[PDB]
Amino acid sequence: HMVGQLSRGAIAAIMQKGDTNIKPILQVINIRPITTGNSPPRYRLLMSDGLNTLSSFMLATQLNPLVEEEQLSSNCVCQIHRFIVNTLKDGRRVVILMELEVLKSAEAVGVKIGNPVPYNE
Amino acid sequence: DNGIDDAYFLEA
């Protein structure tokens, strides 16, 4: 019952209700740098709550060391302690992760948990 | 949910 470790429904609650008081437990599915320019790199995450995945997660620049020193990597399980939602002009929403704790390393989790499906925004 | 491109993503 590995999906029981994840906050199933947190993604829908964030995107539909604007709920930002929750501290959801999510799994990183993928991380990649996004094209920036001459400034700190930015990192985009495909995250899963066990039910849905969402590719619109952005890491605050102050958390870049977690990715660059490899504690925050694909498959790891983390709990979001502070995040904000920003809505673009075209209506799509960005979840910016400001504070998070890696609960279990990627090496200890090992695999994608469950079969989450892409969230329909 | 058509995925947001990087070009419009640090748009804030």
Phi first, then psi: give them for residue A109, nearest 5 degrees. -80, -55
H helix or E strand, kind and range, residue A12 = helix A10-12
User: Quick one: DSSP state of residue A58?
Assistant: E
CB atoms within 10 A of CB A105: 16
Picking from A43, A88, A97 by the largest number of B CB atoms within 10 A of its own CB, the best residue to mutate is: A88
User: Is the Cβ–Cβ distance between A40 and A60 less than 8 Å?
Assistant: no
B10: Cβ contacts below 8 Å, ≥ 6 apart: A34, A36, A42, A58
Residues of A in contact with B7 (CB under 8 A): 35
Residue A8, SS3 per DSSP: coil
Burial of A21 (0-12, 13-18, 19+ CB in 10 A): exposed
- Range 97-116 of A in CB contact (< 8 A) with B: none
> What φ, ψ does residue A116 adopt, rounded to 5°?
-70, 150
Taking the Cβ of residue A85 and every Cβ of chain B, the question of whether any pair is shorter than 8 Å is answered with no
- Per CB-CB distance under 8 Å, the chain A contacts of B10 are 34, 36, 42, 58
Owning domain of residue A26: 1-121
Tally of domains within chain A: 1
Q: What six digits make up the tokens of A41?
A: 């790199």
Q: What is the CATH number of the domain that holds A11?
A: 2.40.50.140
How far apart CA A117 and CA A80 sit, in angstroms, is 20
